[PDB]
mmCIF file of C-alpha atoms in Angstrom:
data_model
loop_
_atom_site.group_PDB
_atom_site.id
_atom_site.type_symbol
_atom_site.label_atom_id
_atom_site.label_comp_id
_atom_site.label_asym_id
_atom_site.label_seq_id
_atom_site.Cartn_x
_atom_site.Cartn_y
_atom_site.Cartn_z
ATOM 1 C CA UNK E 21 9.780 17.512 10.368
ATOM 2 C CA UNK E 22 8.886 17.710 13.679
ATOM 3 C CA UNK E 23 5.135 16.685 12.579
ATOM 4 C CA UNK E 24 6.848 12.929 10.634
ATOM 5 C CA UNK E 25 9.449 12.430 13.731
ATOM 6 C CA UNK E 26 6.766 12.417 15.745
ATOM 7 C CA UNK E 27 4.414 10.140 13.462
ATOM 8 C CA UNK E 28 7.732 8.159 13.430
ATOM 9 C CA UNK E 29 7.417 7.107 17.020
ATOM 10 C CA UNK E 30 3.315 5.881 16.000
ATOM 11 C CA UNK E 31 4.371 3.510 13.655
ATOM 12 C CA UNK E 32 6.890 1.136 15.713
ATOM 13 C CA UNK E 33 4.057 1.370 19.138
ATOM 14 C CA UNK E 34 0.997 0.755 16.573
ATOM 15 C CA UNK E 35 3.159 -2.746 17.055
ATOM 16 C CA UNK E 36 2.950 -3.493 20.710
ATOM 17 C CA UNK E 37 0.897 -5.729 21.558
ATOM 18 C CA UNK E 38 1.919 -8.660 20.279
ATOM 19 C CA UNK E 39 -1.131 -10.537 19.324
ATOM 20 C CA UNK E 40 -1.319 -8.591 16.075
ATOM 21 C CA UNK E 41 2.574 -8.940 15.625
ATOM 22 C CA UNK E 42 1.524 -12.742 15.508
ATOM 23 C CA UNK E 43 -1.818 -11.902 13.455
ATOM 24 C CA UNK E 44 0.603 -10.284 10.533
ATOM 25 C CA UNK E 45 3.187 -12.811 10.463
ATOM 26 C CA UNK E 46 0.226 -15.013 9.034
ATOM 27 C CA UNK E 47 -1.118 -11.922 6.649
ATOM 28 C CA UNK E 48 2.156 -12.243 5.318
ATOM 29 C CA UNK E 49 1.979 -16.132 4.444
ATOM 30 C CA UNK E 50 -1.009 -15.703 2.413
ATOM 31 C CA UNK E 51 -4.211 -13.199 2.888
ATOM 32 C CA UNK E 52 -7.054 -14.295 4.967
ATOM 33 C CA UNK E 53 -10.732 -12.679 5.317
ATOM 34 C CA UNK E 54 -12.253 -12.218 8.813
ATOM 35 C CA UNK E 55 -13.785 -15.248 9.840
ATOM 36 C CA UNK E 56 -10.354 -16.781 8.401
ATOM 37 C CA UNK E 57 -8.396 -15.235 11.146
ATOM 38 C CA UNK E 58 -11.431 -16.445 13.680
ATOM 39 C CA UNK E 59 -8.886 -19.740 13.645
ATOM 40 C CA UNK E 60 -5.706 -17.942 14.278
ATOM 41 C CA UNK E 61 -7.311 -16.709 17.772
ATOM 42 C CA UNK E 62 -10.728 -17.285 16.675
ATOM 43 C CA UNK E 63 -13.329 -15.686 19.414
ATOM 44 C CA UNK E 64 -14.974 -12.957 17.993
ATOM 45 C CA UNK E 65 -15.526 -10.979 14.424
ATOM 46 C CA UNK E 66 -16.531 -8.220 15.646
ATOM 47 C CA UNK E 67 -13.226 -8.011 17.612
ATOM 48 C CA UNK E 68 -11.118 -8.489 14.935
ATOM 49 C CA UNK E 69 -13.193 -5.843 12.673
ATOM 50 C CA UNK E 70 -12.125 -3.769 15.806
ATOM 51 C CA UNK E 71 -8.407 -3.503 15.175
ATOM 52 C CA UNK E 72 -8.059 -4.183 11.735
ATOM 53 C CA UNK E 73 -9.968 -0.527 11.839
ATOM 54 C CA UNK E 74 -7.142 0.781 14.138
ATOM 55 C CA UNK E 75 -4.254 -0.545 11.574
ATOM 56 C CA UNK E 76 -6.282 0.873 9.136
ATOM 57 C CA UNK E 77 -6.117 4.649 10.000
ATOM 58 C CA UNK E 78 -2.171 4.993 11.250
ATOM 59 C CA UNK E 79 -2.049 3.117 6.990
ATOM 60 C CA UNK E 80 -0.378 -0.095 7.809
ATOM 61 C CA UNK E 81 -3.021 -2.204 6.367
ATOM 62 C CA UNK E 82 -5.822 -1.576 3.337
ATOM 63 C CA UNK E 83 -8.902 -3.227 3.127
ATOM 64 C CA UNK E 84 -10.591 -4.219 -0.840
ATOM 65 C CA UNK E 85 -14.235 -5.330 -1.879
ATOM 66 C CA UNK E 86 -14.603 -7.823 -4.395
ATOM 67 C CA UNK E 87 -18.208 -9.314 -4.353
ATOM 68 C CA UNK E 88 -20.023 -9.472 -0.601
ATOM 69 C CA UNK E 89 -17.155 -10.448 1.154
ATOM 70 C CA UNK E 90 -14.605 -7.819 1.954
ATOM 71 C CA UNK E 91 -10.667 -9.818 1.445
ATOM 72 C CA UNK E 92 -7.359 -7.672 3.553
ATOM 73 C CA UNK E 93 -3.432 -8.051 2.838
ATOM 74 C CA UNK E 94 -0.870 -6.025 3.565
ATOM 75 C CA UNK E 95 -0.595 -2.734 1.634
ATOM 76 C CA UNK E 96 3.504 -2.952 -0.403
ATOM 77 C CA UNK E 97 6.472 -5.328 -0.146
ATOM 78 C CA UNK E 98 7.799 -3.028 2.164
ATOM 79 C CA UNK E 99 6.088 -4.566 4.895
ATOM 80 C CA UNK E 100 7.428 -7.803 3.894
ATOM 81 C CA UNK E 101 11.203 -6.769 4.532
ATOM 82 C CA UNK E 102 10.417 -5.084 7.465
ATOM 83 C CA UNK E 103 8.818 -8.250 9.624
ATOM 84 C CA UNK E 104 11.666 -9.802 7.835
ATOM 85 C CA UNK E 105 15.231 -8.061 8.555
ATOM 86 C CA UNK E 106 13.954 -7.730 12.732
ATOM 87 C CA UNK E 107 14.000 -11.602 12.827
ATOM 88 C CA UNK E 108 17.301 -11.605 11.135
ATOM 89 C CA UNK E 109 19.175 -9.375 13.893
ATOM 90 C CA UNK E 110 17.294 -11.011 16.875
ATOM 91 C CA UNK E 111 18.722 -14.042 15.027
ATOM 92 C CA UNK E 112 22.806 -13.788 14.229
ATOM 93 C CA UNK E 113 22.847 -16.661 15.180
ATOM 94 C CA UNK E 114 25.260 -16.681 11.770
ATOM 95 C CA UNK E 115 26.898 -19.512 10.384
ATOM 96 C CA UNK G 15 9.146 -20.033 19.683
ATOM 97 C CA UNK G 16 7.106 -17.829 21.786
ATOM 98 C CA UNK G 17 11.100 -16.850 23.543
ATOM 99 C CA UNK G 18 11.541 -15.071 20.090
ATOM 100 C CA UNK G 19 7.930 -14.356 20.128
ATOM 101 C CA UNK G 20 8.851 -12.460 23.194
ATOM 102 C CA UNK G 21 11.763 -10.752 22.351
ATOM 103 C CA UNK G 22 10.907 -9.197 18.660
ATOM 104 C CA UNK G 23 8.111 -7.398 21.307
ATOM 105 C CA UNK G 24 12.134 -5.661 23.073
ATOM 106 C CA UNK G 25 13.660 -4.677 19.858
ATOM 107 C CA UNK G 26 11.080 -1.616 19.057
ATOM 108 C CA UNK G 27 10.601 -0.857 22.256
ATOM 109 C CA UNK G 28 13.546 -0.431 22.648
ATOM 110 C CA UNK G 29 13.343 2.424 20.350
ATOM 111 C CA UNK G 30 10.374 4.364 22.268
ATOM 112 C CA UNK G 31 11.400 7.854 23.105
ATOM 113 C CA UNK G 32 12.468 9.515 20.370
ATOM 114 C CA UNK G 33 15.498 11.312 21.154
ATOM 115 C CA UNK G 34 16.789 8.244 20.664
ATOM 116 C CA UNK G 35 15.729 7.975 17.193
ATOM 117 C CA UNK G 36 17.634 10.675 16.304
ATOM 118 C CA UNK G 37 20.644 9.660 18.049
ATOM 119 C CA UNK G 38 20.318 6.830 15.910
ATOM 120 C CA UNK G 39 20.032 8.786 12.988
ATOM 121 C CA UNK G 40 22.786 10.561 13.497
ATOM 122 C CA UNK G 41 25.558 7.580 13.917
ATOM 123 C CA UNK G 42 23.986 6.262 10.320
ATOM 124 C CA UNK G 43 25.069 9.108 8.412
ATOM 125 C CA UNK G 44 28.918 8.572 10.703
ATOM 126 C CA UNK G 45 29.637 7.678 13.289
ATOM 127 C CA UNK G 46 30.755 10.336 15.983
ATOM 128 C CA UNK G 47 32.839 9.886 19.706
ATOM 129 C CA UNK G 48 31.063 10.410 22.989
ATOM 130 C CA UNK G 49 31.404 14.098 22.964
ATOM 131 C CA UNK G 50 31.083 14.577 19.734
ATOM 132 C CA UNK G 51 27.425 13.729 20.880
ATOM 133 C CA UNK G 52 27.464 16.120 22.809
ATOM 134 C CA UNK G 53 26.592 18.754 20.002
ATOM 135 C CA UNK G 54 23.371 16.881 19.355
ATOM 136 C CA UNK G 55 21.426 17.122 22.795
ATOM 137 C CA UNK G 56 24.111 18.949 25.011
ATOM 138 C CA UNK G 57 24.121 17.654 27.979
ATOM 139 C CA UNK G 58 26.200 15.943 30.317
ATOM 140 C CA UNK G 59 28.714 13.178 28.823
ATOM 141 C CA UNK G 60 27.435 10.702 31.682
ATOM 142 C CA UNK G 61 24.293 11.215 30.705
ATOM 143 C CA UNK G 62 24.920 9.264 27.025
ATOM 144 C CA UNK G 63 26.869 6.682 27.918
ATOM 145 C CA UNK G 64 24.209 5.928 30.966
ATOM 146 C CA UNK G 65 22.272 5.530 27.870
ATOM 147 C CA UNK G 66 24.131 4.028 24.759
ATOM 148 C CA UNK G 67 24.842 1.720 27.415
ATOM 149 C CA UNK G 68 21.141 0.365 27.083
ATOM 150 C CA UNK G 69 21.785 0.126 23.593
ATOM 151 C CA UNK G 70 24.295 -2.732 24.102
ATOM 152 C CA UNK G 71 22.291 -4.896 26.149
ATOM 153 C CA UNK G 72 19.725 -5.130 23.375
ATOM 154 C CA UNK G 73 22.655 -5.831 20.976
ATOM 155 C CA UNK G 74 21.603 -2.557 18.541
ATOM 156 C CA UNK G 75 24.888 -0.752 18.706
ATOM 157 C CA UNK G 76 28.456 -1.876 19.501
ATOM 158 C CA UNK G 77 31.904 -0.629 20.496
ATOM 159 C CA UNK G 78 35.340 -0.818 19.254
ATOM 160 C CA UNK G 79 38.889 0.477 21.070
ATOM 161 C CA UNK G 80 41.144 2.055 18.579
ATOM 162 C CA UNK G 81 43.906 4.017 20.514
ATOM 163 C CA UNK G 82 42.303 5.708 23.614
ATOM 164 C CA UNK G 83 38.859 6.426 22.260
ATOM 165 C CA UNK G 84 36.239 4.244 22.153
ATOM 166 C CA UNK G 85 34.103 4.994 18.670
ATOM 167 C CA UNK G 86 30.659 3.696 18.245
ATOM 168 C CA UNK G 87 28.626 2.620 15.198
ATOM 169 C CA UNK G 88 25.817 0.695 13.987
ATOM 170 C CA UNK G 89 25.710 -3.186 13.985
ATOM 171 C CA UNK G 90 25.250 -3.692 10.044
ATOM 172 C CA UNK G 91 23.898 -3.348 7.082
ATOM 173 C CA UNK G 92 19.818 -4.077 8.880
ATOM 174 C CA UNK G 93 20.047 -1.227 10.749
ATOM 175 C CA UNK G 94 20.871 1.428 8.219
ATOM 176 C CA UNK G 95 17.931 -0.151 5.776
ATOM 177 C CA UNK G 96 15.322 -0.695 8.440
ATOM 178 C CA UNK G 97 14.896 3.088 9.619
ATOM 179 C CA UNK G 98 14.912 4.012 5.712
ATOM 180 C CA UNK G 99 12.299 1.633 4.652
ATOM 181 C CA UNK G 100 10.400 3.005 7.820
ATOM 182 C CA UNK G 101 10.629 6.584 6.869
ATOM 183 C CA UNK G 102 9.527 5.146 3.030
ATOM 184 C CA UNK G 103 6.716 4.178 3.535
ATOM 185 C CA UNK G 104 5.339 6.336 5.604
ATOM 186 C CA UNK G 105 6.003 8.944 3.917
ATOM 187 C CA UNK G 106 4.367 7.864 0.508
ATOM 188 C CA UNK G 107 4.769 10.359 -2.073
ATOM 189 C CA UNK G 108 1.945 9.225 -4.436
ATOM 190 C CA UNK G 109 1.403 10.588 -8.141
#
């Protein structure tokens, strides 16, 4: 079980850099293509591709084939909530 | 805006070290006192009372008064779920 406890730690860390945190918020509202994301932070597609490849190793993201363009998107409905519940506790301004 | 974004980041990193991740799992199952925890990692109470103070700065934990013993417990029903869902995605027993 020690292996799991170690992984449960790599998960969060994989969220460190905030720059990625924003990208996650975008996909949350609605999937997006590689070049499409360029807008958000824009720059070089090669930069985004490299990253998306890292998150793919953690099993947090999933890519699919559709014609001649690779579309991305969340894995399930667990990530969505997580993100939310996050801002919840943070913003406990109740009423 | 940017203010919150910066925070949401302080939350995670606030879980770094796994040593703490364990202490939380213990509270989730059932509250515990300062000395009681000693059984968990066992050591110097001053050590726990010190850390338990850091987690109090984030608001993740809360303390209460009951006679002459300071009892600790979760903040609400948001942390409990979070911890769960986490181990839920990490361990995806397909089939």
